[PDB]
Design an enzyme around this catalytic site. Structure first.
Site, PDB file in Angstrom:
ATOM      1  N   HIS B  45      -3.099 -21.445   1.085  1.00  0.00           N
ATOM      2  CA  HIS B  45      -3.059 -22.155   2.331  1.00  0.00           C
ATOM      3  C   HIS B  45      -2.760 -23.622   2.232  1.00  0.00           C
ATOM      4  O   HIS B  45      -2.892 -24.310   3.220  1.00  0.00           O
ATOM      5  CB  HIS B  45      -4.346 -21.925   3.112  1.00  0.00           C
ATOM      6  N   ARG B  70      -6.387 -20.523  -6.727  1.00  0.00           N
ATOM      7  CA  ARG B  70      -6.132 -19.430  -5.837  1.00  0.00           C
ATOM      8  C   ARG B  70      -4.621 -19.151  -5.677  1.00  0.00           C
ATOM      9  O   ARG B  70      -3.933 -19.925  -5.034  1.00  0.00           O
ATOM     10  CB  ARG B  70      -6.727 -19.705  -4.462  1.00  0.00           C
ATOM     11  N   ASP B  84      -0.101 -18.906 -17.727  1.00  0.00           N
ATOM     12  CA  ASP B  84       0.666 -19.622 -18.761  1.00  0.00           C
ATOM     13  C   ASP B  84       0.567 -21.150 -18.688  1.00  0.00           C
ATOM     14  O   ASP B  84       0.560 -21.819 -19.741  1.00  0.00           O
ATOM     15  CB  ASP B  84       2.098 -19.100 -18.792  1.00  0.00           C
ATOM     16  N   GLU B 149     -12.393 -10.060   2.691  1.00  0.00           N
ATOM     17  CA  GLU B 149     -12.113 -10.757   3.947  1.00  0.00           C
ATOM     18  C   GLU B 149     -11.934  -9.831   5.160  1.00  0.00           C
ATOM     19  O   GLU B 149     -11.535 -10.282   6.224  1.00  0.00           O
ATOM     20  CB  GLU B 149     -10.836 -11.593   3.784  1.00  0.00           C
ATOM     21  N   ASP B 175     -11.882 -15.561   7.818  1.00  0.00           N
ATOM     22  CA  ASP B 175     -11.022 -14.371   7.827  1.00  0.00           C
ATOM     23  C   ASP B 175     -11.862 -13.153   8.211  1.00  0.00           C
ATOM     24  O   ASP B 175     -11.434 -12.293   9.002  1.00  0.00           O
ATOM     25  CB  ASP B 175     -10.333 -14.159   6.461  1.00  0.00           C
TER      26      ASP B 175
HETATM   27 CO   LIG Z   1      -9.396 -16.227   3.399  1.00  0.00          CO
END
Ligand SMILES: [Co+2]
Ligand SMILES: [Co+2]
Ligand SMILES: [Co+2]
Ligand SMILES: [Co+2]
Ligand SMILES: [Co+2]
Ligand SMILES: [Co+2]
Lengths: 251, 251, 251, 251, 251, 251
Positions: B45, B70, B84, B149, B175
């Site tokens: 996000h 994330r 990596d 979620e 969510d």
């Molecule tokens: Co979420």
């Protein structure tokens, strides 16, 4: 827009390469003048994207060394974007069977021969429409190299080799050795046997074998056997090992 | 290359975190010195990619705060690239069932335990092969956190918790509340009940519960209940709200 | 292309400001929506250059908050460049005397009133020659603010205030306190006296006094004395202190 | 946060556009002042990503020209990320049937109407939560345009037009002509017939037809027929052709 | 914020260094792990600026190798900027006399000892005001190294060595040889004599001699004579020569 | 490393040019294929720096069009930096007299002929020391063009033309007209007379006259009088005017 790397492979001229993981247009230029036949811009295991590939292609352009690009995976969308910024030779990772090889080939070719989306006006590929008859010439100068990195892929090799448009097959010894149980160390007889047998089978089918190998004696062995696109080192390793050796000489 | 965040969760030491959406290596460094146990670099996000993650990891490196990343989704290719550049702790969005949890875990692990592609020479992960025996040590220092979620994910939680390699389960209240019919506002009794029940079930399974919550009383409640990785604020919100409050004090 | 900040100062309307050192077009937009009258893009003490100033001006543009830019020094070449990317209000550091103030003003004006070099076809300033009669209208919309930062500058203040085109005089308490021997803490009666006397004298001349001060009680005291551009916080400070406070509340 | 482009299409006001492939926030601003109703930021065939889209949106923001973004494919994850940086009008490539159209629409809408993930605090979309009731207002201001580029898509057009949330259907003549056997040259009677018939069918369904066409007579023909979002040129082509013509006039 | 490089020179411990011209935060990290005592970020002859110096300092930070930065010239404005992003050891080019050496020292020190401008809230140097009493501790941790590059500078060396705050004197063999008429090859007895005599004289004064020399035999000869900061290679050279050697070994 | 632009001027072959203010390596490549003899990378009035000049030089390199770079001023430090990244032809602004012209020439030449600092191992200019005898061949391939922009400079033109190493004299009509009181419109008989008289006088001395002029009739008039480097358009103008014209043709 003739693809000279592709012509060389077809003619059986071995091409000596260097792997580029430094992800920099500046070091790419420096290395483009070092005398290699080809340079691999790694989008899979180095922090590159379409935009950094573009700048590295621009840096390499006036030099004799030919660029090859490795996308992060066998993804039509990513392939399309790479082709539009001017990529003509692709090294496609984790190709496991003939169907996957065929998808890679078709991703690079305009209909009806493939599914390449048209966007010539916008693209460095056609030099923004300055290349006359680009749409009609583009397919024949695309060079598709597929990576075989698993026992499953080795088993399917004869079928992969039968795919038209597959110009070469690259063996990744580290990934292969990992798949075979040897943890990424290819210096085991079973692994070398498999590699040697693949190189021979590929060359016997009329296609180009390729490999990356930092051990210079192994590289010469693979060339002697018939490999045609052999990368003999990696930029990051050359730099790190030369720097460490230098510091060590002074304590 | 020991993963100290992972060790802390295992030992039941609560880890207080801050979310990073400013997508800047400069503000990342500034915030790395603020005393948090962990920092979340948000690729989902916020406008980050593998390259900006890399620069934020470099900025955070000399500080005690531990980075967690994330990815935009539960994507093996994106996971490989993040690992990596040196990512060892992942927060994976929208994990709906045990099969998806297992795919996330295997994406982080070298064969045979997983499908992580080998590219050690090129990667910051091994410090370009300076970490001795990296291939053999890497798997055990990977820490996989999965986000639940949806109502479907809640239903599947017992099975998700049975997946080896799942070290923690993160609940996203916004969510979840949206999925449950409350439009992203988690302050409804049905939603808090579900969150509380999940935190307990997770901790009872021997795994780490996590959550992001900007309301400091709710955060303390979740910590009291047994949550082990709690993000207590977001960089963008801290900045925006402090700036707005300041301007308001002068008219 | 009316300079509304400049018009506000001339009309005696105090302008409340925030200092921007995060050097990011992303946090600049975020902060542009926070309700300040003006925002200071710092090219002296933050890692900005002409190019990052440009992107920050683009980000701020649709918001009501007006940008002011601080060059690294009173350099007519740097000033020319900042003006061409669209800067209309400049905060010039280390102006020691009336000759230096004159040089700053003249750097912002086209001949015969100054030495500003012409390049409108190229410049965001004229919107690439879309603004009708740009060359004829530009001089009057430039707003020059000069920083007095030493005892020498304080001594020359009456002559500096006599310079046509100097619209405002900004006092930098940290630098001033350092020059005065109280390095660099401005909470000493003799520094506060120098500051407050300068504010009164500047306003008495019909020009705008300015200052940066993070202490809100002092800020209001300066406003009471007639200060007209008062920066009341710094982005990096706001973020660092809020983050540190939050982390501490959780142990 | 009202989507004025969407309102205009709904009201039957034709919108004249320019395609942006220069992938630069600087040229985007220059072109945002040129008088177009809309500008297409091309993520598919130009070297853009979420981050460059963001900077181009910031550049365009204070101008009357409205931004439309084309993702690289009909990908929910990429759509989510584009929406979070503030994209409200999407042009989605290679939509082949009603199911694909529906997936595009649902990717843009919060539950229950869609699967858009929540991340308001972090996102330019809500101006970092300054837009009151953003979650409740966001869905109605999303505008989804789908591209039909194959014979298969043409066959499915009636069903695609029946998908609620599909606000417009864009025809790509080059891709369509390629699919139809004419190699990307749309100047063949069979191709023009198909295009004309699609434009009519779209407009008769109460939806907006769109197209990109550099031939100004063809563009006027399509507008006369009822097309409502017509891109009449491409930045790269305008620049290249104007430069080449200029050099040619001097030899 | 102790300057360990500075302490080592003062204690007579020779420091072995590598020159960084690749202008990349990525290769800087790679090289930071190679075992050198110090690394020279070249802002004079490599395409760096304040912003790329910053990212390189961030990359090097967690490693033992200490950064030294070379500004493009002895410019107090550039020096101020480099110090604020966290530079503590400077290598100042083309210092011709004792007045210029004094100016370099004073550019690095807060009043009354110098003219360094104050901006700690904004600066990585104080870690955004986290370092307690930064203003009081900073001066003593600055390390100033001046380059003597001409016959004029050699003549003034005794006066330059008498300047308080000059911690080291660096001889640039290429520039010196060019000034002496042997342009720019330093393998001539009269250049070597000037170099070696300067090293002896510098060390005799109790200050540190430095030099860049890629020839390892000469490097050891200079160390034997008392040189204390010796750069023994350059990144771009190491990479170019290793790559060229490799390619040549394969024909 | 032959400077072909320099050789063309010396041979009396007129060179037709385009000004580049878009400050992008991408549009630079596009324009490099358009058929101009030379391209002006503007570091004075466009948001470029040493680093963006570098990327533009890399982009242009494989094309026939020759780059010329304009520094922000006649600054030997900036000149040194531009030369090291590979600049061979410089257009130096605001040269007022023969001493300033001499200073520009000397900034481009290694001792004893000038004061250019040595750093070839690091520099693209020598291709990192690949070009044999770079130090010995570089001076003769530098091409220095000086801008006369004021009445003062016009008065000193005969002395400026007597300076060895000044290969060309460029007249800037906008700046000149502004200095002459016709700010900044050069369509007045007295400005045209000054311009045309200077072109004749420059060519008479055996040096190359240059000018930027977007009016094609005037451009041909200047060519008829002996002008040898004539820039006939500006990228930003070409793009803005074509876009505006297109939009207007559609209402
Ligand atoms: Co979420
Ligand atoms: Co592999
Ligand atoms: Co100050
Ligand atoms: Co299409
Ligand atoms: Co030197
Ligand atoms: Co000019």
């Amino acid at each position: 827009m003739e693809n000279s790397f592709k012509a060389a492979l077809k003619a059986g001229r071995p091409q000596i390469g260097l792997w580029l993981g430094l992800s920099s247009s500046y070091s790419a230029e420096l290395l483009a003048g070092a005398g290699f036949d080809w340079l691999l811009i790694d989008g899979e295991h180095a922090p590159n994207n379409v935009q950094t590939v573009l700048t590295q292609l621009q840096a390499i352009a006036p030099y004799p060394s030919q660029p090859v690009v490795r996308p992060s995976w066998n993804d039509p969308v990513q392939i399309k974007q790479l082709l539009d910024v001017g990529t003509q030779t692709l090294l496609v990772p984790m190709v496991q069977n003939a169907d996957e090889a065929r998808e890679a080939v078709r991703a690079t070719r305009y209909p009806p021969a493939g599914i390449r989306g048209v966007g010539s006006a916008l693209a460095r590929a056609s030099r923004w429409n300055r290349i006359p008859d680009y749409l009609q010439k583009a397919n024949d100068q695309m060079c598709v190299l597929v990576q075989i990195e698993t026992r499953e892929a080795m088993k399917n090799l004869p079928q992969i080799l039968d795919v038209e448009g597959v110009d070469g097959v690259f063996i990744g010894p580290a990934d292969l050795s990992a798949d075979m149980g040897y943890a990424g160390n290819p210096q085991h007889p079973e692994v070398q046997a498999a590699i040697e047998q693949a190189i021979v089978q590929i060359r016997e089918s009329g296609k180009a074998p390729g490999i990356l190998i930092a051990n210079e004696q192994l590289a010469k062995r693979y060339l002697e056997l018939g490999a045609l696109f052999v990368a003999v080192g990696v930029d990051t390793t050359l730099l790190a090992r030369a720097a460490e050796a230098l510091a060590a000489r002074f304590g």
